[PDB]
Design a protein around this ligand. Structure first.
Ligand code: ZWY
Ligand code: ZWY
Ligand code: ZWY
Lengths: 225, 221, 226
C-alpha cells in the first residue's frame, strides 16, 4: 500500500531531522563556548566607514585602511598582502580584500560590480556591513517583505540569523565579523567547491587567511616578547 | 583525459534511462483518490488574487481549512521557511503535504531565478502578486505571467524560472512528492550550508505526514 | 587556550593551500601539454558571427550553421543531432546548441532567455563569445568595475582568467573555445550535479559530446582507409 511508504518516509525524515538538529546543536555549542577576545568592535568600523562613505569607494577604501593601520598597528595586512579575491557563496558572487583575520574576528572590504544575490549564510558569528556605495536589500527570515539599505547604513547579520541578501551593480562596503570565524569558512567555500570549481580562488582565500593568522601570531609574540 | 569514460557515462546512462523509462510506463498503467485537484486550488487562488497577498494568504488558508478539515496544518504549525533550490531563493509556508500531494504558499521578496527542477510531479502555481518568467526547455524565448495566471510545470519537464521582488503565489503539487526532496535540499547541502532550514523543512514535512496519518486513522477509527 | 586552535586552523588552511596549488598545477600541466591540431580559429568564428550579428538571432544561427557546414564539411553536427540543452554552471543558467566538439576545440550557440549571471569558470581554455543579441557584462578578476558588451563585440576569456559574467534576458551569442576542453566539463556540470539534480540534462550533455566526438573520429577514419 501507501501507508507503509508514508511510515518509511516519516522515519527517514526523522533521521534527517535528528542529524540536522544535532549538527545545529554542535554549531551552537562550539560557537557559544568559544574564545572571545576582540581587537576591534563593530561600531568603530561602522563609524570609520560611515565617515568616508561620501567619497569615492576606492578613496574610502584607502583612507579606511590607513586609519585602521593607525589605530590598530600590527593587526592589518601590509599593502603587499592586499588582494581582491572573488567570493562565491550561497548563490551570490562578490569580491573581497581581507585586512584582518584571526580565530575570533575578521575585517575586510567587500562588494560586487554586478547585480547579484542569494543566501546570507547561517553561523555563530555577528556580521556587520557598513555601505560605502550602492544598495543592500535584506530579506529577513520568517517575513514576506525586504528592506533596502543605502550608503552610511549598517546592516547587522545577527548570530544564528539567516537572511537573503541582494546587491546591485557597483555596491561596496566595509565588513567586520565577530564570533567563531572558522564556522563561516564552510559557507564561504561551498560554491567554490560545488559550483565554480575555481581552485585558484580557493588557493587565494586560504593563503590570505593563513597570512592573516600568521600576522596575528607574530604581533602577539612581539607584544609578549 | 580519455573520451572513453564519457562514452561509458553516456552509454551507461542510456541503459539506466531506458530501464527507468520502461518502469515509468508500467507505473502509468499500474495507476488504475486525491484530496485536492489543481483546478480547485487554481480557481481558489485566482478568486483572491486581486487582494493584498497577505489577506489572500489568510483567506485561502481559512477556506482550505473550511473545505478540507483535518488536512491543513494548524496556525501553530504554520511557518515561513527559506527554500534555496536550483540557484534561486524563495520562501514557503506549507499547508498540506502527503506522499502524493502537497499545498503551500511560495514566493520571494527579492529578485531571484534559476533551474525549476525536474521530477515526477505535476506542479501548478497560481500567481497572487508579482511576475513569473518561465523559459521552457528546447526553446529560445520565455513568457511572462502575472497575477491570476496559473503556470503548470508538467511531469518530467524542466524549465528556467525567474521571479521579481515581491512575487507570491499558491502552489499545489501532485505525484511522487519525495522525488522532489533531493532538488529541494541540494542547495541547502552544497551551497548555503543552512542546516537549520533543512531541519525546518523536514520537520514541517514530518508534521504534515503525521497530520495526514492522524486524519486517516480518525476516519477509519 | 586559543593558540592551539589557531595553530590547528592554520595547519588545515595550509593543507588546503597545497592541495589547491597541486590541483591548479595539474590543470596547467594537462593544458600546456595537449594537442595543437585546430580545425577553426577564433578570428574565423568571430568574423562569421559579427557579419550576421545584425540579423535576428535565429536567422543568424541558421546562416552561421550553413556557412560552417560549407567551409568545414564533416566537422559540424547534422540537423538531427542539433538540440537545445540547458547549462547550469557557476550560478548562472543558459542553454547551448553544440555544433562541433573535440579534445581541443568546440563551437556552439549559447545564450539565455532570462536575466542570469555568475562565475565564468577557470580552466586552460581560451574562449571567445561574439554577441548576436542582448548584453554581456564582464567583471574581470582583481578589478572593482565591470564592462558592458553589445552585439558585434567579441569578449575573449583568456586562459587561466576568471571573470564574473552577466547576461540580460534574450542574450544570444556564438561561442568558440580552444584549449583543454575536458577541464571545462566539470565546471559545465557542477551546478547540474550539486544544485539542479537534472540528470536528464546531464544525459543530453554527455550525449551531444559523445556524438560530436564520434563524428570527428568517424570523419577521420572514413577519410583514412578504415
Ligand atoms: C563568507 C563571509 C561571511 C559573510 C559574508 O556574507 S554577507 O552576506 O553577510 O555579506 C560573506 C563573507 C565574505 C568573506 C568571508 C566571510 C567569512 C570569513 C572568511 C572566509 C575569511 O576569514 C576570509 C574571507 C571571509
Ligand atoms: C520540493 C518542494 C516542491 C515545491 C517547490 O518547487 S518549486 O518549483 O515551486 O520551487 C520546492 C519545494 C520546496 C519544499 C518541499 C516541496 C515539496 C513538499 C515538501 C517536501 C514538504 O512537504 C516540506 C517542504 C516541501
Ligand atoms: C561550460 C561552457 C564554457 C563557457 C561558456 O560560456 S561562458 O561565458 O561561461 O564562458 C558556457 C559553457 C557552456 C557549455 C560548455 C562550455 C565549455 C565546453 C563544454 C563543456 C563542451 O565541450 C560541451 C558543453 C560546453
Amino acid at each position: 500500500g501507501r501507508s507503509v511508504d508514508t511510515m518509511a518516509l516519516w522515519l527517514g525524515l526523522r533521521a534527517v531531522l535528528v542529524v540536522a538538529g544535532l549538527a545545529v546543536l554542535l554549531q551552537l555549542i562550539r560557537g557559544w563556548l568559544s574564545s572571545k577576545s576582540y581587537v576591534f568592535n563593530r561600531e568603530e568600523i561602522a563609524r570609520l566607514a560611515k565617515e568616508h562613505s561620501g567619497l569615492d569607494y576606492e578613496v574610502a577604501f584607502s583612507k579606511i585602511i590607513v586609519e585602521l593601520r593607525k589605530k590598530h598597528p600590527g593587526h592589518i595586512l601590509q599593502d603587499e598582502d592586499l588582494q581582491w579575491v572573488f567570493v562565491n557563496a550561497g548563490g551570490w558572487m562578490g569580491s573581497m580584500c581581507l585586512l584582518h583575520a584571526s580565530l575570533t574576528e575578521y575585517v575586510l572590504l567587500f562588494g560586487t560590480a554586478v547585480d547579484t544575490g542569494g543566501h546570507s549564510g547561517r553561523y555563530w558569528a555577528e556580521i556587520s556591513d557598513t555601505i560605502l556605495s550602492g544598495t543592500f536589500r535584506q530579506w529577513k527570515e520568517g517575513t514576506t517583505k525586504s528592506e533596502i539599505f543605502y550608503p552610511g547604513d549598517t546592516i547587522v547579520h545577527e548570530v544564528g540569523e539567516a537572511t537573503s541578501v541582494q546587491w546591485s551593480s557597483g555596491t561596496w562596503m566595509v565588513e567586520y565579523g565577530r564570533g567563531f570565524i572558522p564556522s563561516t569558512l564552510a559557507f564561504a567555500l561551498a560554491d567554490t567547491i560545488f559550483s565554480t570549481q575555481d581552485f585558484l580562488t580557493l588557493f587565494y582565500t586560504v593563503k590570505v587567511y593563513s597570512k592573516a593568522l600568521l600576522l596575528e601570531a607574530s604581533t602577539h609574540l612581539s607584544q609578549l616578547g
